[PDB]
Amino acid sequence: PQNTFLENIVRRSSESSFLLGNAQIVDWPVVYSNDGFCKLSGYHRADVMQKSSTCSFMYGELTDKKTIEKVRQTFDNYESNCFEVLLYKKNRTPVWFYMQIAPIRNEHEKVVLFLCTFKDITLFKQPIEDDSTKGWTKFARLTRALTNSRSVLQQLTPMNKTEVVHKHSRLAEVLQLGSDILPQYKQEAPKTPPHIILHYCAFKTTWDWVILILTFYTAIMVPYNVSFKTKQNNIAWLVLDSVVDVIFLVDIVLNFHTTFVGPGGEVISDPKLIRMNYLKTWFVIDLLSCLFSSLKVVRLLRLGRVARKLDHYLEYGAAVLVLLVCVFGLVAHWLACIWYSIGDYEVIDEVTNTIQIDSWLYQLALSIGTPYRYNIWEGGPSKDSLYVSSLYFTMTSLTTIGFGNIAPTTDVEKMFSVAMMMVGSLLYATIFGNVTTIFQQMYANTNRYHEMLNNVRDFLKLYQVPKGLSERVMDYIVSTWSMSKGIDTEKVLSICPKDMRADICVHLNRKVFNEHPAFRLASDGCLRALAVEFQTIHCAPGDLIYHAGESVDALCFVVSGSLEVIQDDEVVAILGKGDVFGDIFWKETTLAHACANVRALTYCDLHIIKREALLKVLDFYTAFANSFSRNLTLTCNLRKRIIFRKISDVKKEEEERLRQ
Amino acid sequence: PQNTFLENIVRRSSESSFLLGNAQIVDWPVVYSNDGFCKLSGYHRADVMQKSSTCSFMYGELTDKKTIEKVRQTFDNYESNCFEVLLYKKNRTPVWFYMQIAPIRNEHEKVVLFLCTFKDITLFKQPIEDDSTKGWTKFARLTRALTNSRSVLQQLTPMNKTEVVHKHSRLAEVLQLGSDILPQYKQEAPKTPPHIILHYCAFKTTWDWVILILTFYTAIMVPYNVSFKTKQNNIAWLVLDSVVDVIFLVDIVLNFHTTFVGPGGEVISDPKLIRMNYLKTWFVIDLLSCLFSSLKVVRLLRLGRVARKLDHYLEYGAAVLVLLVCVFGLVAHWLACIWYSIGDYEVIDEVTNTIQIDSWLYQLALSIGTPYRYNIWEGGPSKDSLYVSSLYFTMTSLTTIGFGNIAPTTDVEKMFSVAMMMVGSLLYATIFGNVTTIFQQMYANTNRYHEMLNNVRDFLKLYQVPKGLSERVMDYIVSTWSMSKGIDTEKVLSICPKDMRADICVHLNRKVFNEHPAFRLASDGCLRALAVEFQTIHCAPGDLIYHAGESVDALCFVVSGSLEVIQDDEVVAILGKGDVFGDIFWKETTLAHACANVRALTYCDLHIIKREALLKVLDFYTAFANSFSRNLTLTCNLRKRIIFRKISDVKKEEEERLRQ
Ligand SMILES: [K+]
Ligand SMILES: [K+]
């Protein structure tokens, strides 16, 4: 979804000087000056910007009020028009320009920008100049300014006293340019010429899958027909063949209206390029469909046609596992057809009309009951058994089993099997390479976890760690792997750019920025800066976050669970579900001593922001800092010591005063 | 083991205002104010805390001494009671509350906390207000304060002059709430309703293993019975079948009382959820046990039942190796039954009552002696050989051996073998993928060590390192791998949180913190800070720790071995087993020059703390620093130079003075 607006203008402009300017703002500031205008006015792209789009910076002592007021009028109410004006220049050279102001609309018509293409007009207007010594200077300037117009612009029929081919020639062209140069400032989708099919839409996927199914059908049924010679059932076989041929011819026709991915870019919806690519690349697939052994053998290239697109159907995983079986079952059938052809060529030696006793069909006939009889030689084994018995041998020879009850024994079957045993070995090797790689990839996820467990267990057993810490660590590892199985936030957020990483971080800490008063009057540009520093810890029962002597250097927000603040072995605070605890960092500038042990009572979730990062963010946006200071009150400040007196001490003091 | 206390209170409270407060401390400071109390009193969770739990901050000019003294009394001796009081508010609005003070006990009864649930009472009491202009304000306030009580609290039979349904309704309810809201402030274990079986306890493991054994037995013995038709021995076969069926029915019944692990949490001991899950998921296993070929074929799903739990029996290692054999031996038996059924269907062609000569049972009968006889056709091969001969063929066809003395030859055995050779190939591929991955995982530990040895050897051979350093490095690598085989402290301690890492580090350096006077008066919060910085080195004989010019910047504690401090090629100190050597860092602030070579005499163990870390820790806890300075005396200070005179120099001087 591109917002291509600066490309539609230039490619239909042919070296213009368009001067897009903002329309909603008063005085219509210029927003983009084309390089063409950088030479037609002598101004660089440093002072045309932020000035009025009405071209009020090119005025002087010669501009007339016949159109300037009209220019302001046509800018007031949004309407295209074709005024003409006399303007000065950076070098103080008065020349005439042909204004072509025209509005440009948004997704919903709002007139956002004002296209203001200029055009030099000096030959076609009466020269006027004041600071000139001789009258030939302006006449020379006529040709000097309009050099491009002397060749192709307005020289179709060059002569004198023909100004009428200059005023009305493009007077009303602005409406004729409504489709040429007046695009829509919209988030456009990939646009295509009429009757062009995109390769990404949800229509070509169904055709791709249908072509895959039909290619498998043809690969299965063509060698069988050209090897096991069968007649035509007409109503159930001829119809299917004709329908498949028509479907593939329609596919060839529709292949002229696809969109190929560019070699160094994205979709190229140019019909000429598509046709050139199809001419250069793939009439091999056109030959096969259009109009015997040879015809079907060349029809078999349709499988190569469907294998060309082996990128949308296939992924690296279970898809390869399915493909490696679907191709094995096809090789075992092609070889089963070739083997039957070889074993049927040599049975009846037609030179002398005798049966060869060292073939494989005759010995199969001897071990199945049905013999061969002489009438010509009559039939032997049935046609429904000559295929099972011929796929059996191929399947034994490809899986390296080799029962050897059907074996090559004449002279040529031994020549064919030598070739079979090479392609079978190669296929077997490729299959057992691919399956090993696929299984390694699949199970590589649960190998790191077990390796980590083994390393931790060996570490805890080698150094004789006590049972308590050993079991605690062993439980912690399992707990962390039970909710973050393989996924690590650091690496995933490392491969993302600076923009969306902030959005992901803001989303992750959505339960501290929403349900907490402090993060209420906060700019988005500051939330995206705080959310990067917010970490997260997953406490467990009995775990201590701050001990009795550690330095409090992190503000913690509890989002799920409960904590216990114990001081002098006395409970003094029970935090839970939306209570902040820590130290006031912005107003103290000194690290403190945690005067109380914070111990978890339930599986807790805390979001921690370090002292340094919080101070750095609060030292930059010194507008949110005041709201943060005045809106965040800590439920348990771990710097102030709470002094109290247990009842036991009071009772002891009373007893002591009772004694004396 | 969770300490869930704040969850039991709320879920049986139904929007209360409980005000847990400490009991041991005098004046009973509040420890946790519920959000419900944040609106019934106008106070936020910033000033109710640390104040008295007797609600002494909500007093004023209208509180009566009829119960305040009684409130202090009931707080003195720990006993629940149900006083009622008139209290003020943050907005100075006097309203009546119903106190429900009740103590809460620890693991051993100690009365730790005081539950003080409040309840607004304004409609049910006579209004009293002083700073009011009109008498209708208090009457309106009656309804304003008690808005929740007008719907469901005390409006079962709403009428007038019915205050008796408000005093005695909940006067003694505190004892009736002893099981409702008065939990135990204990480290609780997972609690379950009566007659509920946990899936983690040591009882369900035995049932799981018994079910596994019985499923293997059924998988072995069902296809044999439904294929090799055998009669009933009654006393030894029917009894086992009935017992197994009863055991599995009992298992189905007991499956209603299990605890499934939550999708996003831990154990869910809710009977309704368990029943809903079992209804939604696994009556496929219920169908099979309850009430021929089809019945046993559907009984075979019990193997799928036991395969559902394939997470507790199995790990990634030798367990998979055992499973891949136990499933191969089962596939080779299921196919051995199917093959015998196929080969027994076609032997006797009952249409014409003749033996088919191209089967596999007849040819087996011809190659074993026993023929088939006609009486109907009488018996042939024995029943104890028809299974061995049928498992032989399957085992040859699955291991890709294929002796081919029993081979498929009729019409259908060739159709069955084509299907066998696909499942066998798939099983073989999966087995040889899993075994390769398992062996790679197992031997990946001893590959890094050999790679390190090879790299070190090649480095020492390429650069022509002298023999001395080469042998020393080669011995050092082996020595380090002989006690730290694969385990590295850095990575193992990297995946642990900040809490237990300190405990592990303290445990590792247990021989410097225990047997040394300096680390005697040290807080735990400082030991956990020093132990993180203590490194460890493993010296070897002849190794030098400090040379004659290096900068002493590390305090070293010897924990095992002996050292030698040589100065001017003279022994001046022999450290060993509990002697510290280094430089006084805290009182000098200048790096020095090691004026003596420290050389190891035996395989030593030193624990080293760097200068910067020691200074940083000693600059924070400026209470342990004084004890460290006054209690640590170095046995060999490597900054002061010991000046002496060898006897050789004295003898030379005496000889020189003798000459002249
Ligand atoms: K093999
Ligand atoms: K073989």
Swiss-Prot record, chains A, B:
Q: Does the keyword Transport apply?
A: yes
Q: What does the annotation give as the result of altering R299H?
A: In DEE112; pathogenic; causes a hyperpolarizing shift in the voltage-gated potassium channel activity and an acceleration of activation; weakens the ionic interaction between residue 327 and negatively charged residues of helix S1-S3 thus favoring channel opening
Source organism (scientific name): Homo sapiens (Human)
Q: Where in the cell is it found?
A: Membrane
Q: What does the entry's domain section say?
A: Contains a voltage sensor domain (VSD) formed from the S1-S4 transmembrane helices, a pore domain formed from the S5-pore loop-S6 domain and the C-terminal cyclic nucleotide binding homology domain (CNBHD). The segment S4 is probably the voltage-sensor and is characterized by a series of positively charged amino acids at every third position.
- Binding site residues for a nucleoside 3',5'-cyclic phosphate: 518-635
Q: What GO terms fall under cellular component here?
A: cell surface; plasma membrane; voltage-gated potassium channel complex
Involvement in disease: Developmental and epileptic encephalopathy 112: A form of epileptic encephalopathy, a heterogeneous group of early-onset epilepsies characterized by refractory seizures, neurodevelopmental impairment, and poor prognosis. Development is normal prior to seizure onset, after which cognitive and motor delays become apparent. DEE112 is an autosomal dominant form characterized by onset in infancy, and a wide range of seizure types including focal and generalized seizures. Cognitive outcomes range from normal intellect to profound intellectual development impairment.
Give the positions annotated as glycosylation sites. Answer: N375
- TM ranges: 208-228, 234-254, 292-312, 319-339, 415-435
Gene that this sequence comes from: KCNH5
Cite the ranges annotated as topological domain Extracellular. Answer: 229-233, 340-387, 409-414
Explain what the record says happens when changing I431T: In DEE112; uncertain significance
Q: Which residues form the PAS domain?
A: 2-80
Q: What is this protein called?
A: Voltage-gated delayed rectifier potassium channel KCNH5
Short motif Selectivity filter, span: 400-405
Topology class, membrane: Multi-pass membrane protein
All copies of domain PAC, residue ranges: 81-133
